[PDB]
């Protein structure tokens, strides 16, 4: 529809804010980010 | 039935038949004749375009190991569902 | 129904493929582009007349 | 049953008044004044003229035959004459076919006794027809 | 008027009533084909393409051709 | 006056078309059917309106012939083909194409038999092609 | 160098067959190059007389082809199947008999879905030959 | 001035049209043509009998059998095929002669 | 198997050669929208958005020469086959789709993921993306199916009605000379009315179907066009 | 268009020349007067 | 597009243009072929084929 402008480096939220299937995969669960498809979709 | 028969091409002139084996072999002979000369090296893109895909497809056919039976492509009768032969 | 058939589909489709690859260029060069050029002619004539009048007007306006 | 009759009469009267032919209007007025029928008078005049022109037709036929036989007709032959002759040929063919059908008094040829179609005649639903 | 889906084109008037009223009509200058010209019947006096060939004659010619087409095999049948 | 055609219109009314300004308007208020100035242009009303121009005998003050220097441009190139020459070429080509199509139409609809007849009295039943020849080792 | 890619490389003179070509173009242009002959996508012209001439001609030649090339096959099949199953058997009949058979086929065509069904369904007790007559 | 449609001859314009104007469409069309002739270019004898004839298959002369007979006769005569070979018959020549004398 | 046959356009080809050896203006186009994609001025597209005009015009001419003239009795629609129409629509639709895909701009497909960030990505947005990707191919299939079915149904109806009219006209006209003549005249008038109505309906429907056929292709093209604003 | 001269003018072409020729004003006046008279008679 | 051309006002005027002359000839053929079929196919001497029950298209298509 309309033109798409890529976000700036400062406009991209941090990875820790993203949520997985059950909950955020923060510290001690970072390596589970690779396996959680929903977390990757949300990211 | 009769109304359905109105929906056919009205200018059919001639029908020719040819076996897949025969014209495939003739095409291969033509391809060999044109790709044989020395002035067309095997590493040229033209030669590989002519040969590689055909080789790959034939290899895929040879490697096939299917648990089901594929009826012959050119049977005399392929309209009977309960007779694959 | 032959419209639902496939036993001579390739030869049947050759009619469309011949129309697309061999007859469309002839219709393109002989019928379509000529008609659209004919449609173009009047507006281009009008605009070029206006451009010539503009040139003459500018020629006159620079005199003093 | 009466309104329809009145409407038809009115329509035909309007159409009769509409025509702008001096001769037709004059004849209609004269016959209306005298109370006679114009159409029947026209028919009688036509038949009288045709009765008096029979030998004119014969003379014209012989003159036309001489004109055709002498070759003068083909000397000035044009495309219009070709069109007329094609029309003439078509009428001749259709008349020959109609004459054959009337002569045998049947649309189709009659079936011979030795033909295998005799059964069809025997198994007619209505022998009267 | 119409003949089936074919409608007779009609020329749009271009003169105003004031200008039109001042026009003097002189049919003596008109062609013989168009005298007492009627928009509802402009071809009433138009000449025939072939003298003596009526529309009914052509219609009947077609009817006779159809009869020949359907009846020729009844008089001159042919074998398979 | 003659019976020849004029600048093509496409069946369009120029008083309501999208390029109407390109067509001059005369005193009567009817836009021309062509880029030229037309005194007797008219509009006819069928299901759709269409503009018509009737050729007529009219005298126009003819400016004298200029010199060839001021209107001739000798920039012709080998690829260039003029519209007159193109019309000639296309006329001849279409004449021959029309004759060929006429012969094809007559043969197709009046002489060519349909293949695979039930009785076998007309048309071919088909046959095999590309059969091997002189290859005993093939069998 | 062998053949030119440009249409300007002429193969004939400008005056070759000028007369016949001009007659052909006169035939084409007289009715088509007119203001009221505005086509719809080049297929439907505006001139009424083009319809009046071309619809009958198209129907006529299509009908001739259908009657003499397409329906003839069905007619011959009916004749062969109903009178012996062989062409020689049909030819053993006379032209009049063949005419009768072909006209009955025409009757069947004209009824089609609305005619009586006794033309192809044998009523019980009918004495005419059945399907196993020639078998 | 130069234009492809007016200056080039028809074959040249055809190549230009399908190479610099509609190359993807030409590619897809060629793809589909290859597919059709690879998978939709065969018809069995039974299919021909069911649907291959305008008025129906004329069993009373069996044109398919005649066509195949001509095909096989031509192949045998041209390729010098010995149809009496044991592989075709499944038995030796002497056994074939014995069968001929028996029947 | 190789069948040799000919199209039913040879007379029309002859007429085209006769009547188009000289130039003529074209002012009426069945699908005019292929020529006017942009309606707001100062908007322009870097994509070749007018590439479809030539194919559209040729397709309209071809389909009109076949479908419109098929109303004449015994005229044959030579291409009337389901899979042949599938091939035609496949060519056009897949060619344009591959033109957009060869662009190698993945952001062009961002709009396939329907919805906003509020909607759950896996259970709502992804399923909508699946359905939309399915809907593109279904649009291709529906286009060709609609074109095939409309022609087939219209001509079946015409054939059946013509057969009925022939039957009653030939085998029941004698009632004009009988005492039940009014019934036959009523039936005959009804048949004439239905005849005219069917012909008008088919004439309108053929052109409408061609319009819709071209509109589907142009809609495919328009779904992926992006317009810049002149400054 | 000399090659068309032999064809002449048909009825429709003659009508167009008559209505749109130098006598166009007279024909227009006559036609409009006749139509007005017929409309008045109809009412 | 049905924009214009010669349009006969009534039957009698069809002979004022060659194209409409051909049209009225064709209309004559069209309408006159029906009476011919009435006469031919409702004839008294028309007889159904005795072997009509030997074979029918209904057998073949079934
Ligand atoms: C199998 C073999 C069998 C063989 C059997 C034997 C064969 C015969 C052998 C000889 C026998 C002895 C001789 C007998 C001769 C009799 C005839 C005779 O002399 O005639 C002269 C006689 C006039 O003589 P006249 O009185 O001295 O005349 C004085 C002037 O000369 C007057 O001059 P004119 O200027 O008036 O000239 C014109 C005049 C003279 O024209 C003629 O001479 C005509 C031709 C004469 C011969 C006719 C023979 C008829 C025999 C039967 C039919 C055979 C086919 C005939 C084909 C004719 C084609 C034109 O025209 C007419 O006569 C017109 C008649 C038709 C009138 C039409 C009006 C219809 C109105 C309907 C309105 C309905 C509204 C309902 C509303 C309801 C609301 C609830 O005319 C007639 O008798 C006319 C008879 C017409 C009968 C037609 C019947 C057709 C079939 C029924 C209709 C079916 C279709 C339509 C149905 C529609 C639904 C309702
Ligand atoms: C400066 C010199 C002055 C000399 C003055 C001389 C004056 C006197 C006259 C001289 C004598 C006459 C000269 C010829 C006149 C021809 C007619 C004419 O005037 O035309 C107008 C025009 C006159 O020339 P121009 O206007 O001055 O210049 C033309 C432009 O420069 C360029 O034109 P364009 O590019 O715009 O268009 C050319 C062409 C487009 O270009 C081509 O078509 C050329 C390429 C075509 C190739 C087709 C074959 C491909 C096969 C596959 C590939 C095979 C590869 C094999 C490899 C090796 C294998 C070992 O356009 C067309 O196709 C449309 C026109 C078609 C004409 C209609 C043809 C049929 C007429 C039938 C009438 C009779 C019916 C039957 C009657 C029966 C009665 C009972 O000529 C042409 O347009 C040329 C047409 C050429 C068509 C060739 C078609 C050949 C088809 C048969 C092939 C047979 C192969 C057999 C192989 C067997 C193997 C077993
Ligand atoms: C001397 C010529 C060059 C010699 C060779 C040179 C060196 C090699 C060149 C490149 C070879 C490519 C190899 C394959 C690459 C991948 C594609 C693929 O899968 O291919 C499958 C298969 C090849 O098989 P393969 O993979 O090599 O291995 C064999 C397998 O065992 C088979 O397994 P299968 O199950 O796939 O087998 C089924 C069947 C499957 O076969 C097919 O599906 C055949 C499809 C043909 C496609 C044609 C493409 C061009 C279309 C142009 C537009 C036409 C529009 C419609 C016109 C209709 C009316 C004519 O395969 C065959 O039997 C192959 C036979 C191929 C014969 C090709 C003959 C072309 C004739 C063109 C006629 C044009 C007439 C225009 C007249 C106009 C006049 C104005 O088909 C093709 O590759 C077809 C395209 C071949 C193009 C060859 C080069 C250009 C054409 C040169 C000859 C021109 C003759 C003109 C005669 C004019 C007479 C008037
Ligand atoms: C064994 C029996 C024989 C058969 C052998 C066959 C071998 C097959 C090999 C295997 C092939 C496998 C694949 C087959 C797939 C088929 C698919 C198919 O049919 O699709 C439907 C599809 C239907 O297309 P369409 O929409 O009908 O349009 C195509 C039409 O051709 C119309 O389209 P168009 O109008 O757009 O075309 C352009 C047209 C533009 O318009 C024109 O040029 C107008 C003319 C049109 C001609 C073409 C139409 C043909 C009409 C029917 C036949 C006409 C009468 C023939 C009379 C025969 C009498 C026995 O220009 C031309 O046609 C250029 C050629 C012009 C020739 C002019 C010759 C003039 C000679 C003058 C001589 C004067 C001598 C004077 C001496 C004086 C001495 C004192 O067909 C095609 O697309 C073409 C399929 C062709 C595939 C290639 C086949 C291989 C080549 C075979 C050539 C055989 C030559 C030897 C025959 C000898 C007699 C027995
Ligand atoms: C009565 C039954 C009715 C059934 C009706 C069923 C529907 C029929 C519909 C027919 C009409 C519509 C057809 C639309 C088109 C369909 C297209 C399609 O599916 O075709 C697929 C088919 C697939 O081909 P294939 O079937 O030969 O696949 C080979 C795969 N093996 C070897 C494993 C068997 O495509 C073709 O037929 C064309 C193949 C040649 C052209 C492409 C060559 C390049 C390939 C690139 C990848 C591989 C090589 C490496 C890269 C390149 C290196 C140089
Ligand atoms: C833009 C809109 C265009 C609308 C055009 C409207 C045309 C109106 C036609 C009125 C009736 C015409 C009757 C013709 C009779 C012919 C003789 C005959 O027997 O026919 C009977 C035939 C069939 O009648 P039938 O079915 O009763 O036949 C009976 C025959 N038996 C019993 C054996 C089965 O009539 C028709 O089929 C006529 C249908 C016409 C429908 C309109 C077609 C329009 C599309 C084609 C346009 C062509 C223009 C080409 C111009 C040049 C192009 C470059
Ligand atoms: C390149 C050939 C090299 C070998 C020598 C072969 C000579 C064979 C004898 C030829 C005698 C007749 C020649 C007639 C004139 C030919 C003129 C010509 O080539 O015109 C091409 C002209 C097309 O013209 P345009 O495309 O418009 O463009 C032309 C200008 N750019 O083609 C035609 O019209 C066809 C003319 C064919 C003539 C015959 C050609 C024969 C060629 C044979 C080569 C093979 C070797 C033969 C050896 C013969 C030994 C006895
Ligand atoms: C040599 C001919 C003489 C002509 C004289 C005709 C006089 C007839 C007067 C009575 C007619 C009505 C009779 C009513 C019953 C008819 C039944 C019927 O169909 O009869 C057929 C005869 O029918 C025909 O062959 C003719 C049918 C109708 C012919 C129509 C004639 C032309 C009509 C032109 C129409 C054009 C438009 C005009 C409109 C005007 C009216 C609205 C024979 O019947 P069977 O032998 O028992 O059955 C055969 C099946 N085994």
Author numbering:
A (entry chain k): 20 to 62
B (entry chain q): 14 to 98
C (entry chain c): 29 to 92
D (entry chain m): 16 to 144
E (entry chain p): 26 to 105
F (entry chain n): 18 to 156
G (entry chain f): 2 to 136
H (entry chain i): 2 to 104
Give the exact sentences the study uses for this entry:
Mitochondrial ATP synthase consists of the soluble F1 and membrane-bound Fo subcomplexes and occurs in dimers that assemble into oligomers to induce the formation of inner-membrane folds, called cristae. Dissociation of ATP synthase dimers into monomers results in the loss of native cristae architecture and impairs mitochondrial function. Here, we report cryo-EM structures of the intact ATP synthase dimer from Trypanosoma brucei in ten different rotational states. Although overall dimer architecture varies among eukaryotes, we find that subunit-g together with subunit-e form an ancestral oligomerization motif, which is shared between the trypanosomal and mammalian lineages.
Using masked refinements, maps were obtained for the membrane region, the rotor, and the peripheral stalk. The membrane region includes eight conserved Fo subunits (b, d, f, 8, i/j, k, e, and g) arranged around the central proton translocator subunit-a. For subunit-b, a single transmembrane helix superimposes well with bH1 from yeast and anchors the subunits-e and -g to the Fo. In our structure, the lumenal half-channel, which displays a local resolution of 2.55 Å, is filled with a network of resolved water densities, ending in a chain of five ordered water molecules (W1–W5). The presence of ordered water molecules in the aqueous channel is consistent with a Grotthuss-type mechanism for proton transfer, which would not require long-distance diffusion of water molecules. The distance of 7 Å between the last resolved water (W1) and D202a, the conserved residue that is thought to transfer protons to the c-ring, is too long for direct proton transfer. Instead, it may occur via the adjacent H155a. Instead, the position of bH2 is occupied by a fully ordered phosphatidylcholine in our structure (PC1). The e/g module is held together by four bound cardiolipins in the matrix leaflet, anchoring it to the remaining Fo region.
